[PDB]
Amino acid sequence: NVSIEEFTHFDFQLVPEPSPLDLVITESLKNHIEVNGVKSGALLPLPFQTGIGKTYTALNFLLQQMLEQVRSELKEENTGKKSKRLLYYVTDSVDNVVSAKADLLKLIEKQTVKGEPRFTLEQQEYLKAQIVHLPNQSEQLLQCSDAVLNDVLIGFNLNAERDVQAEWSAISGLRRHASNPEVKISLNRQAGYFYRNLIDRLQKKQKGADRVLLSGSLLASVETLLPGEKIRNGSAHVAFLTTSKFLKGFHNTRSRYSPLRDLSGAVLIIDEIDKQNQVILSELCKQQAQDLIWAIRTEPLRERLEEFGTNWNLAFAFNTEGANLNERPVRLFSDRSFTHVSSATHKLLLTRFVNEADVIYQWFLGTMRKAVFQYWLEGTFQEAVQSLLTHFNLQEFESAVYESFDTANKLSSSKSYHHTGLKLVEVAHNQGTRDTVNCKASFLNTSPSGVLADMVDAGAVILGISATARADTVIHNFDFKYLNERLGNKLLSLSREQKQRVNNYYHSRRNYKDNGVVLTVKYLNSRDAFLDALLEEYKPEARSSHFILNHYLGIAESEQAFVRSWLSKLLASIKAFISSPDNRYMLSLLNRTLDTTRQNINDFIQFCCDKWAKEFNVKTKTFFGVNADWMRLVGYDEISKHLNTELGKVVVFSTYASMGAGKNPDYAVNLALEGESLISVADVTYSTQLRSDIDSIYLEKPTQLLLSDDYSHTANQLCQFHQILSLQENGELSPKSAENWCRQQLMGMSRERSLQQYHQTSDYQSAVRKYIEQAVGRAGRTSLKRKQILLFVDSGLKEILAEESRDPSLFSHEYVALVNKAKSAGSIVEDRAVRRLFNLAQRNNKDGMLSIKALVHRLHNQPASKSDIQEWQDIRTQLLRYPTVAFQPERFNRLYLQSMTKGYYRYQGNLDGDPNSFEFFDRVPYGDMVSEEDCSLATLVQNQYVRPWFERKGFACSWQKEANVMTPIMFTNIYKGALGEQAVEAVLTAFDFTFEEVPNSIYERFDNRVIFAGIEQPIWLDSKSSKIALVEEEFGPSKFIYVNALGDTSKPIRYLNSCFVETSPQLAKVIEIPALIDDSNADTNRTAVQELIKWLHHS
DNA sequence: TTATTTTTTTTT
């Protein structure tokens, strides 16, 4: 055992010479420190290609962070402020976490500086003790030898308990052989459960007063059994754990440490970050559908339950009338803002009932979160969580507080789906009852992009490394338009100079041009004559090719037209490969595994391969169904071994899912079998070993791109609705399309019919190019190239790859070749930012439309809350002060829509009608316009009194000509009325009137209560009879004033009674001033104000 | 119309 004192004379300035991928990370984080500060998080997406140093420059960064903590601890050991920096390396694959851990451990041992070993052996053993790998509970238990668990069981006195020792004996006996797959599955279940129970006992023993003192061999055994113990102990910086294990959290001897709550300071390396969206999404919708009718049978929230039982009559059992709901349940879906659908029915009060119950439940969960914050480090946090729930009415409850910290918002706040989620409710008669029914509510409270932005906001310096980290899709990647809006400049990016420096590095390690490697791309069309000849030679005696496909290959007539197409393209690729003289190793990337389920197709393909092998005088080996089960049961080195030892060619039949990340395809070169066809495309080679990789590929079009979840039926619905709402949020779907897709997904949409609606976006094509960019990127992993690389592409991809228009600076050579070939025979691409502007304008208008309807309704439900009134006033003041803003505001974002013409736009729509039917920018050349000249803001602030008022209050005397303009709803319903109110308040105040806030009892019924000197009889103002009756019911005799901001001053003043009927001034109750300001010359209507003053004198 | 394979972790 060695200590940190070993680094006494170690020189921390002797760093290995950094490759242009290390300098990029160093410079980006050094810049991040200057811009954002030391204590701020970050998110640096790094598009590094696999195979040119992606994992060395990540583990060398981890090692430099490790060595920046030895220095800090040596310097600060006197001070004692030993808050360790938690370094994480997370990736979704267990096989990649272990591989990365072992690669770092080999990097520590083998790294040299200036030809000398970097670390003396004591420092090698010190640094390798800091690294803990955190596998799941089962593999963490089976990692433990008999001695470790014997010592732990004796040390905590758990050896004397017969149940624990019985379970441990059973586990040892099973592990002695562990051969059959079912045996190992049972052993894994057993190990997981026993580790659960053992760690529960350990945690209870440590939590109490009679604790165990851990030191020496017992501590070593606990730290072997519990690696998270070292992290809590302070004996390990670095954790190598998957994404799922990162979100779950790992155990230590006192609690379950969840890394998502102590991110302050964490340096987190997420490898293949874009893939984490699907993973984090799959753990977001793994929750359970928690019933609500049963739930509300279980301090102000107690009175709220009483009031719920008072109004919705909870004392009565809830029974549903009508049809039998169990044949097809009646469902309710709701994004928590502006999009709400349900199974076909005319409003069914169920929607309000279910929404009210879910509001009860969500407010209840928020109440526990606030109670925990009040009560209050994981030990104290979990103690608070356990204690608060421990009382009389919650004894039978679930206690799901932790998932909230692991995982609707008003205007005047940043509205987005990525932190409001979705709510889905399903109603059916309960198990074994017909009078009682259930409301199985399940919901998302964030999206994976919301989780990532929460992690970055919390302090974590996330460093996501993936060749397509910034792919422009939102279903197969994070929403980097939300992350840029939310995070701001904590979403780091590498500059243009750094991109071209990385590009120079990559070209230096892959110098195809100077060496003569030729990437030859061909796009394969389906040919019927080719396949018909091959089939009629496969079974000569059959009377037709369709007969061959129907009888022998087993293809029914319905799928025959599809099988012919994809089979014909694939066989064309194989023929073109085998005829290629010196190419040697092919990979076919289909969408389906050609396993035993497709054995007749395999027989035909192998027949054709043998045909062409004989014809062209080479021997070709085919590897059908190179599966995930195959690559586990039978190593991929069986291909490499064949290529290293036997002459000929190799055809490998894999899929897009099967060849995931970390499944390295290169083989070990033998110059006896390669000939003169291999050349080296690198300037300086880091190894004497010779290896080579794929040199022919077939790329079938990716088909099943809408990701789905097979965990459950209620987990598939949440995934599908998440994808629909993430497409609506990004602007890919209009609110019309998104709501039709949502309400059809409710009623039982197929998959072939959800997929056809995915295909109408441009997100789909970005996902297809993401699939094709990785497929050819995982093939080029070594610097020995053939003098000719064949790429065969499904012709369906030519029209999709031809539209790749991003910057070619980081594209691999193969993908550049694919896209350049696609372009040369393609096409005015329909701009996507333009369509996105239309869709987002419609969505912002719909959001403002429904939120204003709701807010005005709430203000009309007396009494009005202070939150609602303050939101109303915040919105009106924001629109008055900032009618148009330069940048999309973070906090008031859906009062605005981004226009195409700065300062104004055109629309047609019914502000009292359907928010989906709104049309907008030049798509409407003649329509209602939203401009300064329409609110007459120029005529209003030309008044002698109004302009000083608008200047003092800080309002806008004219609209700035900026891109973001108010939505039609905000312009019409709110802004113009705000201008009228401010103008009349300005004009009247200068004539010795005073204005005071309306009482909450009659808010929004009238503009303001106005108090004028000399009159104790109250007055009310309405500026642009039941309200009059109610106001006189509350406050007695009042005279109401109706005035306009501007208009015709020549009109006579109208004296009216309570019924809007003309009457004498002495009998006049409501005075109607046609215009306080002249519509033509902005002269104050002094005549009308004198009349009002005199009429109040004679009141 | 569109046409699939693939994981991970904790519990029950």
JSON list of N, CA and C (backbone and C1' of nucleotides) in Angstrom, two decimals, chain A residues 136-137 189 245 592 627-628 658 703-704 752 756, chain B:
[
{"chain": "A", "resi": 136, "resn": "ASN", "atom": "N", "xyz": [-23.18, -3.68, -12.06]},
{"chain": "A", "resi": 136, "resn": "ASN", "atom": "CA", "xyz": [-24.43, -3.82, -11.34]},
{"chain": "A", "resi": 136, "resn": "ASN", "atom": "C", "xyz": [-24.26, -4.78, -10.17]},
{"chain": "A", "resi": 137, "resn": "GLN", "atom": "N", "xyz": [-25.32, -4.93, -9.38]},
{"chain": "A", "resi": 137, "resn": "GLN", "atom": "CA", "xyz": [-25.21, -5.63, -8.11]},
{"chain": "A", "resi": 137, "resn": "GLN", "atom": "C", "xyz": [-24.83, -7.09, -8.31]},
{"chain": "A", "resi": 189, "resn": "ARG", "atom": "N", "xyz": [-29.83, -13.89, -10.87]},
{"chain": "A", "resi": 189, "resn": "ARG", "atom": "CA", "xyz": [-30.95, -13.45, -10.05]},
{"chain": "A", "resi": 189, "resn": "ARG", "atom": "C", "xyz": [-30.62, -13.60, -8.57]},
{"chain": "A", "resi": 245, "resn": "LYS", "atom": "N", "xyz": [-26.59, 2.73, -14.73]},
{"chain": "A", "resi": 245, "resn": "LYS", "atom": "CA", "xyz": [-26.06, 2.72, -13.37]},
{"chain": "A", "resi": 245, "resn": "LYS", "atom": "C", "xyz": [-25.79, 4.13, -12.87]},
{"chain": "A", "resi": 592, "resn": "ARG", "atom": "N", "xyz": [-32.07, -6.30, -41.01]},
{"chain": "A", "resi": 592, "resn": "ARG", "atom": "CA", "xyz": [-32.61, -7.55, -40.50]},
{"chain": "A", "resi": 592, "resn": "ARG", "atom": "C", "xyz": [-31.52, -8.61, -40.48]},
{"chain": "A", "resi": 627, "resn": "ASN", "atom": "N", "xyz": [-24.66, -11.82, -35.52]},
{"chain": "A", "resi": 627, "resn": "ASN", "atom": "CA", "xyz": [-25.66, -11.25, -34.64]},
{"chain": "A", "resi": 627, "resn": "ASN", "atom": "C", "xyz": [-24.99, -10.75, -33.36]},
{"chain": "A", "resi": 628, "resn": "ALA", "atom": "N", "xyz": [-25.80, -10.23, -32.43]},
{"chain": "A", "resi": 628, "resn": "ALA", "atom": "CA", "xyz": [-25.27, -9.94, -31.11]},
{"chain": "A", "resi": 628, "resn": "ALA", "atom": "C", "xyz": [-25.04, -11.22, -30.32]},
{"chain": "A", "resi": 658, "resn": "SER", "atom": "N", "xyz": [-26.81, -4.51, -34.86]},
{"chain": "A", "resi": 658, "resn": "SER", "atom": "CA", "xyz": [-25.84, -5.51, -34.43]},
{"chain": "A", "resi": 658, "resn": "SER", "atom": "C", "xyz": [-24.44, -4.93, -34.32]},
{"chain": "A", "resi": 703, "resn": "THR", "atom": "N", "xyz": [-34.50, 1.54, -41.83]},
{"chain": "A", "resi": 703, "resn": "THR", "atom": "CA", "xyz": [-35.96, 1.56, -41.90]},
{"chain": "A", "resi": 703, "resn": "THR", "atom": "C", "xyz": [-36.63, 1.99, -40.60]},
{"chain": "A", "resi": 704, "resn": "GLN", "atom": "N", "xyz": [-36.42, 1.25, -39.52]},
{"chain": "A", "resi": 704, "resn": "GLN", "atom": "CA", "xyz": [-37.25, 1.44, -38.35]},
{"chain": "A", "resi": 704, "resn": "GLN", "atom": "C", "xyz": [-36.68, 2.53, -37.45]},
{"chain": "A", "resi": 752, "resn": "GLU", "atom": "N", "xyz": [-46.69, 0.83, -38.64]},
{"chain": "A", "resi": 752, "resn": "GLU", "atom": "CA", "xyz": [-46.44, 1.18, -40.03]},
{"chain": "A", "resi": 752, "resn": "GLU", "atom": "C", "xyz": [-47.09, 2.51, -40.37]},
{"chain": "A", "resi": 756, "resn": "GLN", "atom": "N", "xyz": [-44.91, 6.16, -41.06]},
{"chain": "A", "resi": 756, "resn": "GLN", "atom": "CA", "xyz": [-45.14, 6.95, -42.27]},
{"chain": "A", "resi": 756, "resn": "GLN", "atom": "C", "xyz": [-45.33, 8.42, -41.94]},
{"chain": "B", "resi": 1, "resn": "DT", "atom": "P", "xyz": [-49.57, 3.03, -50.37]},
{"chain": "B", "resi": 1, "resn": "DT", "atom": "O5'", "xyz": [-48.73, 3.38, -49.06]},
{"chain": "B", "resi": 1, "resn": "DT", "atom": "C5'", "xyz": [-48.63, 4.72, -48.61]},
{"chain": "B", "resi": 1, "resn": "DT", "atom": "C4'", "xyz": [-48.00, 4.78, -47.23]},
{"chain": "B", "resi": 1, "resn": "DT", "atom": "C3'", "xyz": [-46.56, 4.28, -47.16]},
{"chain": "B", "resi": 1, "resn": "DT", "atom": "O3'", "xyz": [-45.79, 5.10, -46.30]},
{"chain": "B", "resi": 1, "resn": "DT", "atom": "C1'", "xyz": [-47.91, 3.03, -45.68]},
{"chain": "B", "resi": 2, "resn": "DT", "atom": "P", "xyz": [-44.19, 5.12, -46.42]},
{"chain": "B", "resi": 2, "resn": "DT", "atom": "O5'", "xyz": [-43.73, 3.95, -45.44]},
{"chain": "B", "resi": 2, "resn": "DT", "atom": "C5'", "xyz": [-44.32, 3.83, -44.16]},
{"chain": "B", "resi": 2, "resn": "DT", "atom": "C4'", "xyz": [-43.78, 2.61, -43.44]},
{"chain": "B", "resi": 2, "resn": "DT", "atom": "C3'", "xyz": [-42.41, 2.17, -43.92]},
{"chain": "B", "resi": 2, "resn": "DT", "atom": "O3'", "xyz": [-41.62, 1.78, -42.83]},
{"chain": "B", "resi": 2, "resn": "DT", "atom": "C1'", "xyz": [-43.93, 0.39, -44.12]},
{"chain": "B", "resi": 3, "resn": "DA", "atom": "P", "xyz": [-40.07, 1.44, -43.05]},
{"chain": "B", "resi": 3, "resn": "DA", "atom": "O5'", "xyz": [-40.03, -0.14, -42.96]},
{"chain": "B", "resi": 3, "resn": "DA", "atom": "C5'", "xyz": [-40.80, -0.79, -41.98]},
{"chain": "B", "resi": 3, "resn": "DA", "atom": "C4'", "xyz": [-40.77, -2.30, -42.16]},
{"chain": "B", "resi": 3, "resn": "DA", "atom": "C3'", "xyz": [-39.46, -2.86, -42.70]},
{"chain": "B", "resi": 3, "resn": "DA", "atom": "O3'", "xyz": [-38.89, -3.74, -41.76]},
{"chain": "B", "resi": 3, "resn": "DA", "atom": "C1'", "xyz": [-41.34, -3.82, -43.78]},
{"chain": "B", "resi": 4, "resn": "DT", "atom": "P", "xyz": [-37.43, -4.34, -42.01]},
{"chain": "B", "resi": 4, "resn": "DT", "atom": "O5'", "xyz": [-36.72, -4.21, -40.60]},
{"chain": "B", "resi": 4, "resn": "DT", "atom": "C5'", "xyz": [-37.19, -4.96, -39.51]},
{"chain": "B", "resi": 4, "resn": "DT", "atom": "C4'", "xyz": [-36.10, -5.13, -38.48]},
{"chain": "B", "resi": 4, "resn": "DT", "atom": "C3'", "xyz": [-36.25, -6.32, -37.55]},
{"chain": "B", "resi": 4, "resn": "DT", "atom": "O3'", "xyz": [-34.98, -6.81, -37.23]},
{"chain": "B", "resi": 4, "resn": "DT", "atom": "C1'", "xyz": [-36.14, -4.37, -36.29]},
{"chain": "B", "resi": 5, "resn": "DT", "atom": "P", "xyz": [-34.77, -8.29, -36.66]},
{"chain": "B", "resi": 5, "resn": "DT", "atom": "O5'", "xyz": [-33.42, -8.15, -35.84]},
{"chain": "B", "resi": 5, "resn": "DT", "atom": "C5'", "xyz": [-32.36, -7.39, -36.39]},
{"chain": "B", "resi": 5, "resn": "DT", "atom": "C4'", "xyz": [-31.66, -6.57, -35.32]},
{"chain": "B", "resi": 5, "resn": "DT", "atom": "C3'", "xyz": [-31.24, -7.34, -34.07]},
{"chain": "B", "resi": 5, "resn": "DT", "atom": "O3'", "xyz": [-29.88, -7.11, -33.82]},
{"chain": "B", "resi": 5, "resn": "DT", "atom": "C1'", "xyz": [-32.37, -5.36, -33.49]},
{"chain": "B", "resi": 6, "resn": "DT", "atom": "P", "xyz": [-29.15, -7.85, -32.59]},
{"chain": "B", "resi": 6, "resn": "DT", "atom": "O5'", "xyz": [-29.27, -6.81, -31.40]},
{"chain": "B", "resi": 6, "resn": "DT", "atom": "C5'", "xyz": [-28.61, -5.57, -31.48]},
{"chain": "B", "resi": 6, "resn": "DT", "atom": "C4'", "xyz": [-28.99, -4.70, -30.31]},
{"chain": "B", "resi": 6, "resn": "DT", "atom": "C3'", "xyz": [-28.82, -5.37, -28.97]},
{"chain": "B", "resi": 6, "resn": "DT", "atom": "O3'", "xyz": [-27.51, -5.12, -28.49]},
{"chain": "B", "resi": 6, "resn": "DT", "atom": "C1'", "xyz": [-30.90, -4.17, -29.10]},
{"chain": "B", "resi": 7, "resn": "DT", "atom": "P", "xyz": [-26.82, -6.11, -27.44]},
{"chain": "B", "resi": 7, "resn": "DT", "atom": "O5'", "xyz": [-26.19, -5.13, -26.37]},
{"chain": "B", "resi": 7, "resn": "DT", "atom": "C5'", "xyz": [-26.61, -5.18, -25.04]},
{"chain": "B", "resi": 7, "resn": "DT", "atom": "C4'", "xyz": [-27.46, -3.98, -24.69]},
{"chain": "B", "resi": 7, "resn": "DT", "atom": "C3'", "xyz": [-27.81, -3.88, -23.22]},
{"chain": "B", "resi": 7, "resn": "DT", "atom": "O3'", "xyz": [-26.78, -3.20, -22.56]},
{"chain": "B", "resi": 7, "resn": "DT", "atom": "C1'", "xyz": [-29.67, -3.30, -24.63]},
{"chain": "B", "resi": 8, "resn": "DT", "atom": "P", "xyz": [-25.66, -4.01, -21.76]},
{"chain": "B", "resi": 8, "resn": "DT", "atom": "O5'", "xyz": [-25.71, -3.36, -20.31]},
{"chain": "B", "resi": 8, "resn": "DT", "atom": "C5'", "xyz": [-25.93, -1.98, -20.19]},
{"chain": "B", "resi": 8, "resn": "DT", "atom": "C4'", "xyz": [-27.15, -1.69, -19.34]},
{"chain": "B", "resi": 8, "resn": "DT", "atom": "C3'", "xyz": [-27.24, -2.49, -18.06]},
{"chain": "B", "resi": 8, "resn": "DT", "atom": "O3'", "xyz": [-26.51, -1.84, -17.04]},
{"chain": "B", "resi": 8, "resn": "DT", "atom": "C1'", "xyz": [-29.39, -2.12, -19.11]},
{"chain": "B", "resi": 9, "resn": "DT", "atom": "P", "xyz": [-25.73, -2.69, -15.93]},
{"chain": "B", "resi": 9, "resn": "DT", "atom": "O5'", "xyz": [-26.49, -2.32, -14.58]},
{"chain": "B", "resi": 9, "resn": "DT", "atom": "C5'", "xyz": [-26.92, -1.00, -14.37]},
{"chain": "B", "resi": 9, "resn": "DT", "atom": "C4'", "xyz": [-28.33, -0.99, -13.82]},
{"chain": "B", "resi": 9, "resn": "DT", "atom": "C3'", "xyz": [-28.56, -1.93, -12.65]},
{"chain": "B", "resi": 9, "resn": "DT", "atom": "O3'", "xyz": [-28.29, -1.25, -11.45]},
{"chain": "B", "resi": 9, "resn": "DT", "atom": "C1'", "xyz": [-30.37, -2.01, -14.24]},
{"chain": "B", "resi": 10, "resn": "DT", "atom": "P", "xyz": [-28.20, -2.06, -10.07]},
{"chain": "B", "resi": 10, "resn": "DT", "atom": "O5'", "xyz": [-29.70, -2.08, -9.54]},
{"chain": "B", "resi": 10, "resn": "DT", "atom": "C5'", "xyz": [-30.43, -0.87, -9.44]},
{"chain": "B", "resi": 10, "resn": "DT", "atom": "C4'", "xyz": [-31.82, -1.13, -8.89]},
{"chain": "B", "resi": 10, "resn": "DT", "atom": "C3'", "xyz": [-31.87, -2.13, -7.75]},
{"chain": "B", "resi": 10, "resn": "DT", "atom": "O3'", "xyz": [-32.82, -1.72, -6.77]},
{"chain": "B", "resi": 10, "resn": "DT", "atom": "C1'", "xyz": [-33.21, -2.90, -9.54]},
{"chain": "B", "resi": 11, "resn": "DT", "atom": "P", "xyz": [-32.87, -2.44, -5.34]},
{"chain": "B", "resi": 11, "resn": "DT", "atom": "O5'", "xyz": [-34.07, -3.49, -5.47]},
{"chain": "B", "resi": 11, "resn": "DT", "atom": "C5'", "xyz": [-35.40, -3.08, -5.20]},
{"chain": "B", "resi": 11, "resn": "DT", "atom": "C4'", "xyz": [-36.32, -3.42, -6.36]},
{"chain": "B", "resi": 11, "resn": "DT", "atom": "C3'", "xyz": [-37.54, -4.29, -6.01]},
{"chain": "B", "resi": 11, "resn": "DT", "atom": "O3'", "xyz": [-38.72, -3.70, -6.53]},
{"chain": "B", "resi": 11, "resn": "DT", "atom": "C1'", "xyz": [-36.38, -5.20, -7.86]},
{"chain": "B", "resi": 12, "resn": "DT", "atom": "P", "xyz": [-40.10, -3.79, -5.70]},
{"chain": "B", "resi": 12, "resn": "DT", "atom": "O5'", "xyz": [-40.86, -5.03, -6.36]},
{"chain": "B", "resi": 12, "resn": "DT", "atom": "C5'", "xyz": [-42.08, -5.50, -5.80]},
{"chain": "B", "resi": 12, "resn": "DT", "atom": "C4'", "xyz": [-41.95, -6.93, -5.30]},
{"chain": "B", "resi": 12, "resn": "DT", "atom": "C3'", "xyz": [-40.56, -7.30, -4.78]},
{"chain": "B", "resi": 12, "resn": "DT", "atom": "O3'", "xyz": [-40.68, -8.12, -3.62]},
{"chain": "B", "resi": 12, "resn": "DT", "atom": "C1'", "xyz": [-41.17, -8.76, -6.53]}
]
